[PDB]
Amino acid sequence: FACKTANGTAIPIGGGSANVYVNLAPVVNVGQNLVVDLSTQIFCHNDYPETITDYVTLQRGSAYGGVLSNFSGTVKYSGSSYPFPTTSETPRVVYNSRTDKPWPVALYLTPVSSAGGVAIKAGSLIAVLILRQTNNYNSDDFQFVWNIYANNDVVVPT
Ligand SMILES: OC[C@H]1O[C@H](C/C=C/c2ccc3ncccc3c2)[C@@H](O)[C@@H](O)[C@@H]1O
């Protein structure tokens, strides 16, 4: 079981860390949502599906930088909503193909009422998401750490 981004950045068997750069929407007004859709960007396969089934959760997600300072939000995992920052581990997604499948994670962020001007600086860390991978085979308990970076600024006008 290994993951790669669209960019090419990989985390191999046994897990690891990666830096992921997302284009964000340049402008977001108060009570509009900012979406960080990582299901278009992070992908994962099972390396031996014939006899092994991989089980993947969002263990932990935390907010940094502009998102920590001037956005409240939720995370969507596999079609359900959870608080962000995350208060618990989610239900598991099954991976049983050698073909890449999205990691089904998106953030729904909305500016707090304080927020104005540049509220996310380009190049800044905005989140760290921990994919936890297990299987029906042995004790493997691997962390795939995704460190999410803004490619661009985000302005909250008013
Ligand atoms: O995705 C399945 C597994 O992939 C690797 C270990 C791989 C096992 C294996 C075992 C016997 C094999 N026999 C013939 C050819 C290949 C073989 C591969 C880890 O990421 C693990 O955490 C994950 O569950």
Residue numbers in the entry: 1 to 158
From the study:
FimH adhesin of type 1 fimbriae promotes intestinal colonization by binding to colonic crypts of epithelial cells, facilitating E. coli adhesion and invasion to the urinary epithelium, a key player in UPEC pathogenicity. Importantly, the mannose-specific adhesin FimH has an essential hydrophobic binding pocket of non-polar amino acids that surrounds the aglycon portion of α-D-mannopyranoside glycomimetics. Preventing bacterial FimH adhesion to highly mannosylated glycoprotein uroplakin Ia from bladder cells represents an appealing strategy to control UTIs.
Delightfully, the co-crystal structure of compound 11 and E. coli C43 (DE3) FimH also revealed the expected 4C1 chair conformation of the ligand 11 bound into the active site of the tyrosine gate. In the mannose-binding site of FimH, we observed Tyr48 in parallel, while the Tyr137 residue was in T-aromatic stacking with the quinoline group of ligand 11. Four FimH lectin domains were observed in the asymmetric unit of the crystal and the mannose-binding site of each FimH lectin domain was in proximity with a symmetry-related neighbor in the crystal packing. The two binding sites of FimH molecules were held together by the two quinoline substituents crossed over in a parallel stacking, while their mannosides projected into the binding pocket of FimH. Therefore, the binding of FimH to compound 11 appeared to simulate the bivalent binding of the natural oligomannosidic N-glycan structures. Inhibitor 11 interacted via different amino acids that included Ile 13, Phe 1, Asp 47, Gln 133, Asp 54, Asn 135, Asp 140, Phe 142 in the open conformation of FimH. Interestingly, the inter-molecular π-π stacking of two quinolines residues of 11 triggered the interlacing of two FimH lectins, providing a “bidentate’’ complex. Interestingly, among the mannosides studied, the quinoline analog 11, having an IC50 of 3.17 nM, was the most efficient at reducing FimH-mediated bacterial adherence. Although compound 20 had a higher inhibitory potency (IC50 0.82 ± 0.4) against isolated FimH lectin binding domain, ligand 11 (IC50 3.17 ± 2.3) showed better potency in inhibiting bacterial adhesion to bladder HTB-9 cell monolayers without adverse side effects.
